Each structure stands twice: as C-alpha cells, then as structure tokens.
Amino acid sequence: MQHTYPAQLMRFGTAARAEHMTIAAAIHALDADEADAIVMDIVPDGERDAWWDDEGFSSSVTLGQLQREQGDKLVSKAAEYFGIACRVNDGLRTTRFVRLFSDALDAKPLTIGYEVEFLLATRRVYEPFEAPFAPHCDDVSYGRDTVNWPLKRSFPRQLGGFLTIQGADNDAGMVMWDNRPESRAALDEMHAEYRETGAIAALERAAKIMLKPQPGQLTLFQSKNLHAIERCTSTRRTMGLFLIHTEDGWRMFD
Amino acid sequence: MQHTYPAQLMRFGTAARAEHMTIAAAIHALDADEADAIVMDIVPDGERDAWWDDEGFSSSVTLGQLQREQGDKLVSKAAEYFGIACRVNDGLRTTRFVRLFSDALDAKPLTIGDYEVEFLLATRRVYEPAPHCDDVSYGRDTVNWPLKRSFPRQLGGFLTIQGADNDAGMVMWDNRPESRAALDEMHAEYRETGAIAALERAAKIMLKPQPGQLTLFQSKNLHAIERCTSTRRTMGLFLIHTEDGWRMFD
Ligand SMILES: [Zn+2]
Ligand SMILES: [Zn+2]
C-alpha cells in the first residue's frame, strides 16, 4: 500500500479538485484523460536538497535534443544518446526520484529493439534568460527527420513529471494550453510564427492553465499539450522524466 | 620487452617471407603498406580454449551489420550497437585478445560523438558447417552514414581458436572496391552470372590460418572465407590508425 499526498487536479476551464492521492492514482487519472495536470506535495520542507544530491545522479543528451537532429547527425547523436544512457542509468535507477515511479507503477526504463535503454531522467538547471519564455510539446514520435526517426508511434497520454527543487525569485512557473500540435514540423512552424510575429495566433483561441509549482511539488501533466516555462529571474532547479503506458507496462525516459 | 612470434608475411605476386616479430612490428609493416597480410603464431597449443573462455567475454551487432541498415532502421540498429558496446566493452578490454592490441599499439576503442561513446571492441565468432571488403566508411545508406573517412590501411585481425577439418582458410584478391555500392554491384554480378569478371586475372593470396594463429590483413582488399566442413571458431576486430592513435572496433 502506497503513500498518499496532497494533490490538485486541473482540467481546462474547471476549478482544481483538491484530493489526497497516491502517485499511481494521479498517473491513472491522467492516463484516463480525466485530468490535464496534477500537482502533488511530495517532499517536505528541509528534505528537498536530499533528492537533488541523491548519490544516483553522480556518474547530458535528452530525447528532445535527439529529435532535433537529422540524417547522419541523427545517427551520430543516437549513438551518443544510447551510449550515455547505459553509463548513467545504473545510478539513475537508484534515485529516489526514479524510484517514485518504479515503485508506484512498476515502471521500467523505455527500451528500443537485444534491448538497450533510453536515458531515465535528468536534473535540470534553469539560469535567468531574458526572453518571452520556448512553447513546445513533448511526444516521443516527434522527430524532425520524419523518415529516419525510428519511434513512429504517438502516445496520446504521454506524461511529463517534474519535481521542483529550487524556485526562481519571481516564482517562474508553467503555462499549458489546450492545443496539441500534430508534429515536429507543426511545432517548428509555430516557432517561426513566434520569432516573426511575437505571437502564435492559434493560441488566442486556446484555454490555458497557469501553474506555479513550488519546491517539493511534483507536477504531472499531459505533455502533448503545448506548454512553456516562464522567464526565471534567478536559478530554478527541477528533476524530471516522461512516461508512456506501453503494452508491457509503464516506461520512463528523458 | 614485448613478446616475439613466428610470422609469415604475404604480398600479392611476391614470395611469402618468414620473419619473427612483435605484434607492433607486424601492424606497422601492414600500416606502411609493406605487407597485404601477416599470419603469426601467437597462442601455444595447450592455451587456446583459455583465450576463448576469458571472463572478459562473459556477456552480436557488428559494424558490418550496422552498415547494411538504411533509414530509420539504421538509427534503431545504431542505438542497439552503441548500447551493447557500452554494456560489454569494460569486460572486453580485459581479454587477452583485446590486450594484444591495446598493449602493442596503445590502441583504444574507436569513439564517436560532445560526449564520446565507444564502438564495440571485438567479437567471438562461431562458424557451423560472396567476397567482401571492410572499410569503416562503407555504410550502404551513404547520406546517413556518419563515418566519412576511408583509411586505406584499415586492418582486420582475427585469432583462430578452432579450425575446420578441411582446413578451410581465406582468399584475398588484389582488388579494392571503392564504396559499398561498388561491392553491392559485384554481388549482383556474382549472383547473376556466376563470377566477378574483374577477379579472374587479379593477383590473389591464399591464407590457411591454423588454431593459435593471428591473421592481420588489409581489410579493404576483397576477401572470402572458404566453406568449412566442421565448426570453426575465431575472435576478431578491426584497426584503423586515426589522428588520435590506433583505434579498435568490430
Ligand atoms: Zn515539455
Ligand atoms: Zn573482414
């Protein structure tokens, strides 16, 4: 039997439901399309540093970075990505952060193929950047090189999960819109519309959820929805990964 | 003081030479284009199984296999190849077989990459009862193959552990196909006509590696393994002499 934690469950256009839930229950609600985001109070004050300094992080290419590459550069970056994951996952799988999900869901690292593992998770440092802050979505199928990207299947309930460790001075958080771009090319066009026009005209019609996750909070959300992290005024630290629910069970990757 | 061994040194059209050399000296003779192959007596008759059974092999995608993949399957098969190399190379580094080269040449695994990751070091091969050549740059999917430099003195190196009863060996021709497309074209001629016309009057070397012998050769030359009547077991890798030093991969 599992720990329950204070949770706020958010759906577009609706007041947040406040409940005490297990991690597996929050993840089930998302996978059932019963929530767009859930924010949970996981780590109490004073214990936040221990999750970051966890010895399993000790010893970085992300899948989102791998997806940007094309042709021979995608072959060479895939070699870096998969070669690295194997060096670092032995440590990551022991982290309290990764164990949150392996325990709750019986999750395992996503594998390709012999089977070799995707990278499990990343610690993320956000340094002050004076920009709009950047809207993107995460979908394991969204390689820029459509032909040569080898994960061609989309999971409509793919989740992002990140635990906030240090918050920015200005309390920088996340905006999530009711908009799901259909492909990497669609996001890539949206980026060009932003840089030229300062805006994304399609968004002025979309409902948005603004989230300000605090130190110790885990934010779980449907990562296919467009979203963006606000400009930070000082250092923000988070740890995160993504989840997909496969025929063989829950799988984790970053 | 490094080990010294009996070596036979072959060169197209010239008499086989009998020398006695270190592994480093044999490799440097090939790398100076002063031999096409060298066969050396390395492992004494009582000791061959122990090389096969080295604990460093306790743990199957090769570079040659990866080369034949195209498009998304190339990216997927590359993920498998580099992922496996990460798993197994720490063991492989400790094997007597890999150490022949890392000791002789200060060789290291070939790397690719912002972060450097290793190619697979070596493989043990079991043969149970079409000529080709090996060049690191000869991926079939040329636009997507990331290794663009050809090394003219690329070597293959294999130690024979168990020989076939019919004493099946290796033939090399003085013929160096210029890309994977050239090789695939010759394959289409062998299949469609029953030989490769260009090879008829080409100089050839016939090798008959025995158990305990190391065969080092210039792998860009077309070559073929003769058909075996019984089980043949070998351990093998390739060498290229890069800007950074000698690098091993399979
Ligand atoms: Zn995201
Ligand atoms: Zn060969």
Author numbering:
A (entry chain A): 1 to 59, 75 to 128, 131 to 150, 153 to 273
B (entry chain B): 1 to 59, 75 to 128, 130 to 145, 153 to 273
Text from the published report:
SadA is a member of the dioxygenase family from Burkholderia ambifaria AMMD. This enzyme is useful as a novel biocatalyst for the (R)-selective hydroxylation at the C-3 position of N-substituted branched-chain L-amino acids, especially N-succinyl-L-leucine (NSLeu), to produce N-succinyl-(2S,3R)-3-hydroxyleucine (NSHLeu) with >99% stereoselectivity. One of the oxygen atoms is incorporated into the substrate to form hydroxy amino acid, while the other oxygen atom is used to oxidatively break down α-KG into succinate and CO2. This family of enzymes possesses a common protein fold, which is called the double-stranded β-helix (DSBH) fold, as the core of the structure, and an HXD/EXnH motif in the active site to coordinate the Fe(II) cofactor. The hydroxylation of amino acids is catalyzed by the ferrous [Fe(II)]- and α-ketoglutarate (α-KG)-dependent dioxygenases.
